[PDB]
Tab-separated table of C-alpha atoms in Angstrom:
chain	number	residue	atom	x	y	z
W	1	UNK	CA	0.000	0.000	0.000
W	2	UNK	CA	1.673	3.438	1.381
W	3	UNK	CA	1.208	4.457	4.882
W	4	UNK	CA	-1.484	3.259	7.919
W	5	UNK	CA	-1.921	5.206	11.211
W	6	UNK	CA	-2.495	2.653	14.141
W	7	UNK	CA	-5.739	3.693	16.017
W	8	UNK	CA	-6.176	0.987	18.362
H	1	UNK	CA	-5.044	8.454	33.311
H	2	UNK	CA	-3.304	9.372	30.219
H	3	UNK	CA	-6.340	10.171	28.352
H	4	UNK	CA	-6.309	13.930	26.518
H	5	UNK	CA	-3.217	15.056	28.035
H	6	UNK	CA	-2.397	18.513	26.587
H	7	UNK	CA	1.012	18.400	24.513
H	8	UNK	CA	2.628	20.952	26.884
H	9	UNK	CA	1.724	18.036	29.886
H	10	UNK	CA	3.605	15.329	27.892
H	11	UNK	CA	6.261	17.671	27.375
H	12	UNK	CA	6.326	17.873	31.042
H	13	UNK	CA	6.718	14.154	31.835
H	14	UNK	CA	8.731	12.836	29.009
H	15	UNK	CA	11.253	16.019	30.536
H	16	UNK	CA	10.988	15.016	33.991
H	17	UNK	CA	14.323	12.508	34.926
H	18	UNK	CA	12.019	9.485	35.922
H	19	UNK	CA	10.990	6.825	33.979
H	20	UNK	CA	7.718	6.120	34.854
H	21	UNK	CA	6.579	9.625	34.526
H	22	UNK	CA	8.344	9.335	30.867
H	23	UNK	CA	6.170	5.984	29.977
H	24	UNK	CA	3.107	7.732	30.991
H	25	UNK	CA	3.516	10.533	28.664
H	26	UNK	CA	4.878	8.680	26.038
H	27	UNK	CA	1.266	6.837	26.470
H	28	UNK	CA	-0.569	10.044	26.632
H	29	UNK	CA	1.300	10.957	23.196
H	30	UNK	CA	0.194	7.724	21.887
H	31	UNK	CA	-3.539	8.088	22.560
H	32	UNK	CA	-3.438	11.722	21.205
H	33	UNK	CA	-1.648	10.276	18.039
H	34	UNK	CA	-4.241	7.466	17.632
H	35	UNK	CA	-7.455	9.374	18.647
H	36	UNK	CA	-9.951	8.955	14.959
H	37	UNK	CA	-9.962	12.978	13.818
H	38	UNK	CA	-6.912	15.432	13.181
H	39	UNK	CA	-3.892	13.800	15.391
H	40	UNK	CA	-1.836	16.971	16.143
H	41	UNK	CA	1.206	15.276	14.894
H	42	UNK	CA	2.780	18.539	14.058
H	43	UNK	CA	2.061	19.899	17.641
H	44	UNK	CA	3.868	16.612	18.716
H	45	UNK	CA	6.812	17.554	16.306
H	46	UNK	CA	7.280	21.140	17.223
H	47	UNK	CA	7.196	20.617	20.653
H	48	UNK	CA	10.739	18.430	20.028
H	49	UNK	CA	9.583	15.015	20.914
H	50	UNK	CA	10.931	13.012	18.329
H	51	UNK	CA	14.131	12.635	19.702
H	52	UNK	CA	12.940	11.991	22.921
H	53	UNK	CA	10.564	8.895	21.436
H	54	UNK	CA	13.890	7.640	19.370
H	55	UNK	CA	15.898	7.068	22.469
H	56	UNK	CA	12.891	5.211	24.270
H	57	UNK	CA	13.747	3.095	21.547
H	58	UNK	CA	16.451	1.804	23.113
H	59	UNK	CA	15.512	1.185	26.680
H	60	UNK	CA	15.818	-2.761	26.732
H	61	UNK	CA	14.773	-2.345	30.249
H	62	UNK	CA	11.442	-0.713	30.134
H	63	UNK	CA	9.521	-2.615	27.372
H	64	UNK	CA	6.657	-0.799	27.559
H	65	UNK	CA	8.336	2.722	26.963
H	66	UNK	CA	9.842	0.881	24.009
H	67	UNK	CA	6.402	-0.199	22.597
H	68	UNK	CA	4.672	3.450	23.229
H	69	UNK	CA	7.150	5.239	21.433
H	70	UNK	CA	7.509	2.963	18.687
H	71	UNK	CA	3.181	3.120	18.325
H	72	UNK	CA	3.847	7.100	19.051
H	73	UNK	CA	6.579	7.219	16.171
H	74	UNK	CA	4.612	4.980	13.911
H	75	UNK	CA	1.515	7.460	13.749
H	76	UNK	CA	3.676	10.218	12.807
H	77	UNK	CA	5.034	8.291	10.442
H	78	UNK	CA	1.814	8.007	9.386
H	79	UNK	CA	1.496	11.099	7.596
H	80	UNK	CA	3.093	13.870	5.315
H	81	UNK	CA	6.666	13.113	3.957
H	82	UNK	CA	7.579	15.877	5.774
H	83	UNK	CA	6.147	14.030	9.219
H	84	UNK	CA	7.807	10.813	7.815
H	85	UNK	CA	11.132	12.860	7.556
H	86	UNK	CA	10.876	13.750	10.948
H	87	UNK	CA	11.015	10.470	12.430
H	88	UNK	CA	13.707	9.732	10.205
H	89	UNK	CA	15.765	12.565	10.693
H	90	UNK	CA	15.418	11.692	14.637
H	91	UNK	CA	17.492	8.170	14.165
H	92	UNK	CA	14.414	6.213	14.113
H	93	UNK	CA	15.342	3.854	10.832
H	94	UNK	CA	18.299	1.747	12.775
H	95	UNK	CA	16.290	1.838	16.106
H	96	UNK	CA	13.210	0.558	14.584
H	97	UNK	CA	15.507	-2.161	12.662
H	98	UNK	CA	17.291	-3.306	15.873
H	99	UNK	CA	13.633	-4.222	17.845
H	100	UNK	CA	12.882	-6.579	14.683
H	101	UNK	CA	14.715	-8.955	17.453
H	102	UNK	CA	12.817	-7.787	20.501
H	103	UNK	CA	11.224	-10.837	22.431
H	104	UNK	CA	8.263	-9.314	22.238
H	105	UNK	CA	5.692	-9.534	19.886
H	106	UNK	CA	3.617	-6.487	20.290
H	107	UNK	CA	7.290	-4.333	20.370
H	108	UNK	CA	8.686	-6.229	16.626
H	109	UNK	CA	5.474	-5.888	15.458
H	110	UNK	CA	5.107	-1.989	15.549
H	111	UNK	CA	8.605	-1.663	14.313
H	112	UNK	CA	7.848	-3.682	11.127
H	113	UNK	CA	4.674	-1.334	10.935
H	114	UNK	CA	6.946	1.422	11.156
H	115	UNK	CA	9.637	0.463	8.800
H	116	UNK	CA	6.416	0.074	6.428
H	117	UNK	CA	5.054	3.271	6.879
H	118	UNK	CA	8.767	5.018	6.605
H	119	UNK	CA	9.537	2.525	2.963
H	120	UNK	CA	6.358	3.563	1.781
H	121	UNK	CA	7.067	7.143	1.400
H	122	UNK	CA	8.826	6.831	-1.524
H	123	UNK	CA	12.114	5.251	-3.630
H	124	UNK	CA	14.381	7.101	-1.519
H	125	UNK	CA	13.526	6.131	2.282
H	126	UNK	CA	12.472	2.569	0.699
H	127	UNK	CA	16.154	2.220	-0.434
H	128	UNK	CA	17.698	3.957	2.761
H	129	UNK	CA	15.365	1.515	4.984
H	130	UNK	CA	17.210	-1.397	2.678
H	131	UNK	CA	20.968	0.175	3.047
H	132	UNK	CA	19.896	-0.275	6.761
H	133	UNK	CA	19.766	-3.603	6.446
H	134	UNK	CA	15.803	-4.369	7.396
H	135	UNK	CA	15.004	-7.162	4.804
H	136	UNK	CA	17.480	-9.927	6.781
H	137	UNK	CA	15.370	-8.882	10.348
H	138	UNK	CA	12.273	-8.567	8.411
H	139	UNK	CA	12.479	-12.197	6.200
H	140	UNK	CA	14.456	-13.994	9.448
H	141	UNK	CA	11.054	-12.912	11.170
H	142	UNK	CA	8.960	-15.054	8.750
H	143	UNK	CA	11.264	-17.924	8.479
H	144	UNK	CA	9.459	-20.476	10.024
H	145	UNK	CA	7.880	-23.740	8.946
H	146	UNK	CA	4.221	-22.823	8.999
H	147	UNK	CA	3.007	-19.517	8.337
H	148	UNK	CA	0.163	-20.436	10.186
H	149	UNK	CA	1.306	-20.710	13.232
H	150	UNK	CA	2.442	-16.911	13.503
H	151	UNK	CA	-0.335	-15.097	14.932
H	152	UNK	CA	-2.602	-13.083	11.788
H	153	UNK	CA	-2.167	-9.562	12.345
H	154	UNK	CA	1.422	-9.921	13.040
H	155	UNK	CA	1.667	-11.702	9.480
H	156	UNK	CA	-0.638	-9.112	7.956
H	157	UNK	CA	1.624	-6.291	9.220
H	158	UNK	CA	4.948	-7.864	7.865
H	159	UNK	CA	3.354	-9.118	4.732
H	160	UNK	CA	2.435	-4.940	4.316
H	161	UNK	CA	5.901	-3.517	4.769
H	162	UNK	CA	7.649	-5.665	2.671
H	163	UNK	CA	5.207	-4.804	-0.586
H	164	UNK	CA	6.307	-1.018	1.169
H	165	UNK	CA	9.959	-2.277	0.328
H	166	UNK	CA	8.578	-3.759	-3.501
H	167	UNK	CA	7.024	-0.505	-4.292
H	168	UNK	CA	7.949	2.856	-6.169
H	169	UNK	CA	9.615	3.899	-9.291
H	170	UNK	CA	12.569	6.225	-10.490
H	171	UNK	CA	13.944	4.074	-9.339
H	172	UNK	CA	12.487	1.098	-8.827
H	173	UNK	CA	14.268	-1.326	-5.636
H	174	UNK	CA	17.556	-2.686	-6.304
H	175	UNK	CA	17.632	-6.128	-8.281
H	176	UNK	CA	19.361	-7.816	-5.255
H	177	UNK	CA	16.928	-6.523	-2.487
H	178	UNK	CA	14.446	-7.881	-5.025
H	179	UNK	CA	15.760	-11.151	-5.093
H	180	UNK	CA	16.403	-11.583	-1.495
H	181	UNK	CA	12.637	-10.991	-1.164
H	182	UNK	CA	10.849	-12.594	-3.746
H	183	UNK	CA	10.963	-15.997	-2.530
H	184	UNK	CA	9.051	-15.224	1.120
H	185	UNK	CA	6.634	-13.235	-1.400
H	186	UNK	CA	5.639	-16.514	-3.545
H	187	UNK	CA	5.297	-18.258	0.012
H	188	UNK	CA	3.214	-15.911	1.420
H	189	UNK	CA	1.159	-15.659	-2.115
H	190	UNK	CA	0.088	-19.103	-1.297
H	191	UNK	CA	-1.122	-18.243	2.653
H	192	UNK	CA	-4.529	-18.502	3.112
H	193	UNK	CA	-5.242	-15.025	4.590
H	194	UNK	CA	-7.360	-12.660	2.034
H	195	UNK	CA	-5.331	-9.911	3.318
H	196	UNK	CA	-1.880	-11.109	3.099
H	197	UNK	CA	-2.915	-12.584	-0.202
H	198	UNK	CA	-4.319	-9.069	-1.102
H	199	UNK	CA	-0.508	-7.498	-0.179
H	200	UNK	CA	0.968	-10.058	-1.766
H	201	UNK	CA	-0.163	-9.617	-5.052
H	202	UNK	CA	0.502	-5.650	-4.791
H	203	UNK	CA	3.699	-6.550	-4.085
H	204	UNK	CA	4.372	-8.524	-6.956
H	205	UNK	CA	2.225	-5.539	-9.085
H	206	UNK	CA	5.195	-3.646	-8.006
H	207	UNK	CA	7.611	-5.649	-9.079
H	208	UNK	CA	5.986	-6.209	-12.413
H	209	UNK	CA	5.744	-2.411	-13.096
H	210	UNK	CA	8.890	-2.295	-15.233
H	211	UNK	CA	11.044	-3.590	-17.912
H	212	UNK	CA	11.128	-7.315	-19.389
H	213	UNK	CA	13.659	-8.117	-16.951
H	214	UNK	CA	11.929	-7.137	-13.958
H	215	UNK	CA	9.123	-9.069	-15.317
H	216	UNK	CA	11.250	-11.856	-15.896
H	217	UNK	CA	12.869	-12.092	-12.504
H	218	UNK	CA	8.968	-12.729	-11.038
H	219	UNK	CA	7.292	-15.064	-13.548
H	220	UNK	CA	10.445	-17.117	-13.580
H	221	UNK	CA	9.612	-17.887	-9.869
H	222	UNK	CA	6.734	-20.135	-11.098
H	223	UNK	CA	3.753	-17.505	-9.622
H	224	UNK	CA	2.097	-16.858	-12.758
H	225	UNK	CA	-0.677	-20.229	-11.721
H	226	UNK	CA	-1.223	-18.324	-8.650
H	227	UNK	CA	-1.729	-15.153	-9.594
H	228	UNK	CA	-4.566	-16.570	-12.324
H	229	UNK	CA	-5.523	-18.359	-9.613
H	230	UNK	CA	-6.044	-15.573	-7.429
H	231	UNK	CA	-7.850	-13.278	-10.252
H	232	UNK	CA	-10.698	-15.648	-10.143
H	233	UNK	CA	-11.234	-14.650	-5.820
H	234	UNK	CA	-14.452	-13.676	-4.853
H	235	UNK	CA	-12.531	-11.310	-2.110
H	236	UNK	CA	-12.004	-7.599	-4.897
H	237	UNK	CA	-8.748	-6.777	-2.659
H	238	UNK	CA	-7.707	-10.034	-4.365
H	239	UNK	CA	-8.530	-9.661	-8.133
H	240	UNK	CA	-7.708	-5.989	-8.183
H	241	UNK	CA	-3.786	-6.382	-7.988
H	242	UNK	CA	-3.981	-9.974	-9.167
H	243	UNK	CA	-5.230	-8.591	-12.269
H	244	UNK	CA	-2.718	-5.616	-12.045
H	245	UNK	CA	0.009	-7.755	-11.650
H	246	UNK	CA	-1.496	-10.498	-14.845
H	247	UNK	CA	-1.761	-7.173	-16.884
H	248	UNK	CA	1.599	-5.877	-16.060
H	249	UNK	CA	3.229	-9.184	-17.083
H	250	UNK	CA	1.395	-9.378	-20.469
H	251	UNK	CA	3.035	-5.563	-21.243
H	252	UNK	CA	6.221	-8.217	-21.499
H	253	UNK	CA	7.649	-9.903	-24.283
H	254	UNK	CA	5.324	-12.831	-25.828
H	255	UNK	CA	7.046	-15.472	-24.055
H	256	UNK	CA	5.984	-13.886	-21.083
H	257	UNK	CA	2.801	-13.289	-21.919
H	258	UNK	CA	2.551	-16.672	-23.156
H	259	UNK	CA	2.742	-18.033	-19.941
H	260	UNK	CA	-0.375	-15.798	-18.583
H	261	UNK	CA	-2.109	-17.503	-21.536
H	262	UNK	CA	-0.656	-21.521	-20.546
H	263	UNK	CA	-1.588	-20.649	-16.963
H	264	UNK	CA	-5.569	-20.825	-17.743
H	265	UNK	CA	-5.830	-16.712	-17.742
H	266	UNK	CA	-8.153	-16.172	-20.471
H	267	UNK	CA	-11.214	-18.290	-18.989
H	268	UNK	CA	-11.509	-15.778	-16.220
H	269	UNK	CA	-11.871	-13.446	-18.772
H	270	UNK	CA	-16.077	-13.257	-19.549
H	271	UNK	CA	-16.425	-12.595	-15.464
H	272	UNK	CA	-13.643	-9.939	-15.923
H	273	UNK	CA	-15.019	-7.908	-18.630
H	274	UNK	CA	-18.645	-7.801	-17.275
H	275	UNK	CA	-17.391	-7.351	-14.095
H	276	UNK	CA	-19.806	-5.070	-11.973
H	277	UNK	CA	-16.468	-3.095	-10.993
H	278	UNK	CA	-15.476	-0.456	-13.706
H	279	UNK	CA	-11.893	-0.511	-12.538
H	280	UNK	CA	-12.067	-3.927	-12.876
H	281	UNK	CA	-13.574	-3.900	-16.870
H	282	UNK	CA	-11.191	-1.317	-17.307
H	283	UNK	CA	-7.692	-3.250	-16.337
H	284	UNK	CA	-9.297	-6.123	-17.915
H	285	UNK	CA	-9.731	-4.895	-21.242
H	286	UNK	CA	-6.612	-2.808	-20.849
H	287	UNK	CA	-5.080	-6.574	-20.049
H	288	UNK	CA	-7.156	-7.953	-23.561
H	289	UNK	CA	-5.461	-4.881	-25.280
H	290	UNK	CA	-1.674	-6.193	-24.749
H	291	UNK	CA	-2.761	-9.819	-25.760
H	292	UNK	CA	-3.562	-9.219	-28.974
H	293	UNK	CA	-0.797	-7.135	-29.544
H	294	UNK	CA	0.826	-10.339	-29.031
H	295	UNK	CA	1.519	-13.341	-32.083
H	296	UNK	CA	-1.540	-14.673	-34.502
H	297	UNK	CA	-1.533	-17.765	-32.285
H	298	UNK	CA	-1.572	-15.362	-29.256
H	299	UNK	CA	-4.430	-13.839	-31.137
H	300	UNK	CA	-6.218	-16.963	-31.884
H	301	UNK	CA	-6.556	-18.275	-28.149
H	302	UNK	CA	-8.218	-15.136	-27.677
H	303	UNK	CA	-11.079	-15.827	-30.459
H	304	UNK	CA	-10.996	-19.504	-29.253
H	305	UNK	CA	-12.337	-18.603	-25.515
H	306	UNK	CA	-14.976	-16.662	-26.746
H	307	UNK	CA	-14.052	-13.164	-25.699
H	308	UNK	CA	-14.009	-11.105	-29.315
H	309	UNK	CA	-18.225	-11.167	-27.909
H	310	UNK	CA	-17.246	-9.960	-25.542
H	311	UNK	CA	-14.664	-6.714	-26.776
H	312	UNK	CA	-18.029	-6.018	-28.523
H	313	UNK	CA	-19.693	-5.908	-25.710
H	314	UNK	CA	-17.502	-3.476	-23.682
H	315	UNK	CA	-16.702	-1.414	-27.201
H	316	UNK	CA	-20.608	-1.515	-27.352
H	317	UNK	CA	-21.096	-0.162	-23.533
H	318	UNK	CA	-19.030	0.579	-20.744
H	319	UNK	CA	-17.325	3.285	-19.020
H	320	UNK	CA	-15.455	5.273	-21.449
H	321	UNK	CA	-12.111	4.739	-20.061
H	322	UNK	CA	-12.877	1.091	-20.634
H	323	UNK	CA	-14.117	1.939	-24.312
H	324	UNK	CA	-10.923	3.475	-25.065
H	325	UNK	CA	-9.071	0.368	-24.035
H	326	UNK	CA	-11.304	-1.587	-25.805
H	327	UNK	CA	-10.697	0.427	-29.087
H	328	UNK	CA	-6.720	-0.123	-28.310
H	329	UNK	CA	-7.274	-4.178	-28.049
H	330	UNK	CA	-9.250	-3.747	-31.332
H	331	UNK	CA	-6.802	-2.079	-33.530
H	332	UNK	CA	-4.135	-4.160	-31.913
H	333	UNK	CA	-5.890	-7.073	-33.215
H	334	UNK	CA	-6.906	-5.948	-36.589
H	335	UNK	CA	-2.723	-4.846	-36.902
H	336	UNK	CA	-1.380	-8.238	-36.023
H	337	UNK	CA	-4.404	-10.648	-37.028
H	338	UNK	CA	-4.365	-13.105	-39.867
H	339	UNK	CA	-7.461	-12.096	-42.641
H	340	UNK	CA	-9.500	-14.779	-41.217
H	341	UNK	CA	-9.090	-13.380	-37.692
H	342	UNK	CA	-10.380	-9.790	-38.923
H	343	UNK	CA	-13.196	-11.330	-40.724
H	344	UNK	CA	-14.604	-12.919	-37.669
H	345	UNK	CA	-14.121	-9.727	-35.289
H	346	UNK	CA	-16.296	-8.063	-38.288
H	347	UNK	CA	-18.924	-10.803	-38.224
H	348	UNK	CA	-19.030	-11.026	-34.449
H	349	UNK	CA	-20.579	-7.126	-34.923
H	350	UNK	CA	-17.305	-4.715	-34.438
H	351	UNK	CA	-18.067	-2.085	-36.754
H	352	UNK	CA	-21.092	-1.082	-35.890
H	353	UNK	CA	-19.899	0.028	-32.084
H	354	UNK	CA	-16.300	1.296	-33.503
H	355	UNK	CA	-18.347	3.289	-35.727
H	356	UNK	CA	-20.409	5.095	-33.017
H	357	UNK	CA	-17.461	5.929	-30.954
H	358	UNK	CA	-16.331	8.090	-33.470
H	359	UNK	CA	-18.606	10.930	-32.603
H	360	UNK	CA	-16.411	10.798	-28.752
H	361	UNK	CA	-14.817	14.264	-28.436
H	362	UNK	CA	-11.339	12.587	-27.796
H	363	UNK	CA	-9.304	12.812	-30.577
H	364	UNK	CA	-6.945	10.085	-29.275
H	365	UNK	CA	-9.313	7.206	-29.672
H	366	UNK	CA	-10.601	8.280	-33.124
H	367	UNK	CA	-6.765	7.712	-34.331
H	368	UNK	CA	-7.066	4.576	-33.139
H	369	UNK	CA	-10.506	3.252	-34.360
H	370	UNK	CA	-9.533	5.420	-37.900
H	371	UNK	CA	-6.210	2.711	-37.881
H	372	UNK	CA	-8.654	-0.188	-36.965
H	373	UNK	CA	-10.575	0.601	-40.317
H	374	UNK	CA	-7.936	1.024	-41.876
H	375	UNK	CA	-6.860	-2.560	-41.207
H	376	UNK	CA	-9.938	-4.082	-41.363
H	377	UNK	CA	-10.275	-2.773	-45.100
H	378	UNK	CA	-6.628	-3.990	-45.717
H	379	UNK	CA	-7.963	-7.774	-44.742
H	380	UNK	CA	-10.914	-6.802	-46.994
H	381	UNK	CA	-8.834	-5.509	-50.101
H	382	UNK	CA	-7.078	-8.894	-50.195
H	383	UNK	CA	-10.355	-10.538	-50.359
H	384	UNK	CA	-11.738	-8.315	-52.683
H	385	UNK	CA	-14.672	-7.488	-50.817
H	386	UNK	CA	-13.893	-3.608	-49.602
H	387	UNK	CA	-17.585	-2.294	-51.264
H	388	UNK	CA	-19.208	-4.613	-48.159
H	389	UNK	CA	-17.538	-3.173	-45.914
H	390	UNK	CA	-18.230	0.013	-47.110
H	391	UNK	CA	-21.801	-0.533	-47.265
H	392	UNK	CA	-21.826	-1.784	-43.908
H	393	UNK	CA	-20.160	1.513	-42.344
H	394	UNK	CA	-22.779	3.052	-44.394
H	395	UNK	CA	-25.754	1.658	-43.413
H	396	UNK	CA	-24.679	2.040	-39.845
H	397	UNK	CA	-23.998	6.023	-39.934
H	398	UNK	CA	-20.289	5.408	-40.182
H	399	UNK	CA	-19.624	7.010	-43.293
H	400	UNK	CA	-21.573	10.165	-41.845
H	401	UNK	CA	-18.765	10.102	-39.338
H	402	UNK	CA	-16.067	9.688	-41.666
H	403	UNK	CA	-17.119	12.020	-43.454
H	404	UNK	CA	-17.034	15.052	-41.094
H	405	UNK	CA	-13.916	13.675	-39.703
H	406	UNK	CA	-12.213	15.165	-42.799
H	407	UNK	CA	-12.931	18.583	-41.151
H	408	UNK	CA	-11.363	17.962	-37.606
H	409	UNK	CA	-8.679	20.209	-37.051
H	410	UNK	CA	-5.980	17.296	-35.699
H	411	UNK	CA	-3.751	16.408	-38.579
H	412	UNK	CA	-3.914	12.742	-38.178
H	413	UNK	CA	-7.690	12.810	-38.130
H	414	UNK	CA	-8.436	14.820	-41.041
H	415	UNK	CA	-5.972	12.751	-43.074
H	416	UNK	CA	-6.898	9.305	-42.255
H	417	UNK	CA	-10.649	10.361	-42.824
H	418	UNK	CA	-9.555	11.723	-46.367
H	419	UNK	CA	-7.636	9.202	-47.471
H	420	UNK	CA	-10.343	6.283	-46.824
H	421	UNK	CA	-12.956	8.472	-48.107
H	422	UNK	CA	-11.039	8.374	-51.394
H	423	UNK	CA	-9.956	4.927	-51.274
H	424	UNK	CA	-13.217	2.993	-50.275
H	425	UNK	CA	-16.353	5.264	-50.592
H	426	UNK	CA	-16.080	6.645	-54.294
């Protein structure tokens, strides 16, 4: 993919 | 707790000289970082943290310091190149590469996330991540006998950042890094997880992107089977880059395309090109498009699965980005196609649709369907029978079309138009 943010 | 600190409160702690106080507002950072609308990661940044979260990196003693900075760092990884630069510019890439070998799951885990996040920036921190030396940690992480016995996100999350370390252009990864990957990539190709299946494939859609021998290095790995395989999933994270990947390859030479063919592709096909999906009709026919730009034999597996019905079709109706690659796999066709073959893509009902998308105000796909005609009445010269033809086009409003073509302005247009209306319809 590219990027993710972890949100839990 | 450390719920909704204010950024000036974790500056506070994480500048206090005790390391508890530190771990909870590293915490506090995290949960700001990971909250669902508008993490202030630039507030985080200008208040001078990064530095701070790097060297929590390091504290072998304090675990869960370790793990809050790395989720902390991973978030503002998360975002702009210039936030990715800022966790790179801190130290981060070495200190995220040496917990790859932390005993703990949860703490390796968020450093392959945030490796992932850092490689998928762009060509330049992908290859800096590499000269780092992440893919040994990262592939020594998956070496095991079973993929299923490592736990599914954790797979999912390594799976990710190495199609991070696959993708990009100008330039695209260096040939050995390539290598030294490729063979975890067809292992994980055959896990059973849609989502590491899904990565998978993107990865290998990556590595397909490119010249022969880029293409070569992949389909010589035997994963062409799978990948047809996988274009026939009922899971669209699948077929999307499976077909990416199948459409990439057949951009190759005709060897390589050949094996696409050998591997059972074109049956999928009729599903493909009705598929309720534009994007997916659209890579499909764009995939049709560099198939029969391939040999006659190429050409004639093509007509032999049915699917010349079924470029009428899409010519016929579809979205218009998938007409114009229809109109591409057409005149392909008609310039590489033995006279038989262009007589039965004119009986299976080709001209009328060509014909109608001449009236399309883009002057690039009336070149090509004026070069389809052209061939087609090039086959139909050598049989002698170019008046049909040009009573069919007539009866059909074609010649109407023609016709006024002879007053676009673009050169090309104007003198393709001309010269048929001389040649045929006198």
């Amino acid at each position: 993919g590219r990027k993710k943010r972890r949100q839990r | 707790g450390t719920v909704n600190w204010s950024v000036e409160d974790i500056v506070k702690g994480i500048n206090s000289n005790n390391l508890e106080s530190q771990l909870q507002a590293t915490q506090a950072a995290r949960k700001l970082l990971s909250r669902e609308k508008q993490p202030p990661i630039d507030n985080i940044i200008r208040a001078g943290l990064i530095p701070k979260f790097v060297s929590f990196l390091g504290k072998t003693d304090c675990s869960p310091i370790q793990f809050e900075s790395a989720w902390a760092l991973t978030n503002i990884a998360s975002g702009t190149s210039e936030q990715t630069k800022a966790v790179v510019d801190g130290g981060a890439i070495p200190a995220f590469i040496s917990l790859l070998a932390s005993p703990h799951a949860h703490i390796s885990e968020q450093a392959v996330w945030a490796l992932g996040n850092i490689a998928g920036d762009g060509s330049a921190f992908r290859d800096l991540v590499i000269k780092h030396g992440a893919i040994d940690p990262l592939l020594a992480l998956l070496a095991v006998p079973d993929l299923s016995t490592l736990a599914c996100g954790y797979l999912r999350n390594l799976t990710w950042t190495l199609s991070n370390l696959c993708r990009n252009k100008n330039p695209a990864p260096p040939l050995d890094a390539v290598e030294q990957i490729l063979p975890t990539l067809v292992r994980l190709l055959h896990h059973n997880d849609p989502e590491v299946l899904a990565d998978s494939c993107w990865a290998i859609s990556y590595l397909t992107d490119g010249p022969n021998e880029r293409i070569e290095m992949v389909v010589k790995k035997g994963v062409v089977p799978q990948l047809v395989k996988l274009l026939g999933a009922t899971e669209l994270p699948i077929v999307t880059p499976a077909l990416r990947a199948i459409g990439n390859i057949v951009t190759g030479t005709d060897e390589q395309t050949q094996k696409v063919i050998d591997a059972g592709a074109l049956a999928v096909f009729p599903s493909l090109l009705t598929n309720p999906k534009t994007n997916i009709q659209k890579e499909a026919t764009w995939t049709m498009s560099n198939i029969t730009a391939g040999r006659q034999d190429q050409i004639q597996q093509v007509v032999n699965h049915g699917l010349v019905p079924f470029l009428v079709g899409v010519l016929s109706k579809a979205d218009f980005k998938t007409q114009k690659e229809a109109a591409w796999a057409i005149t392909n066709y008609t310039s590489g196609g033995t006279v038989e073959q262009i007589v039965y893509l004119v009986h299976c009902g080709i001209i009328e649709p060509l014909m109608n998308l001449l009236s399309a105000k883009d002057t690039k796909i009336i070149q090509v369907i004026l070069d389809a005609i052209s061939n087609i009445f090039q086959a139909a010269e050598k049989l002698g029978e170019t008046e049909k033809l040009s009573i069919m086009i007539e009866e059909c409003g074609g010649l109407d079309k023609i016709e006024a073509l002879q007053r676009h302005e673009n050169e090309s247009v104007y003198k393709a138009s001309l010269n048929l209306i001389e040649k045929y319809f006198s």
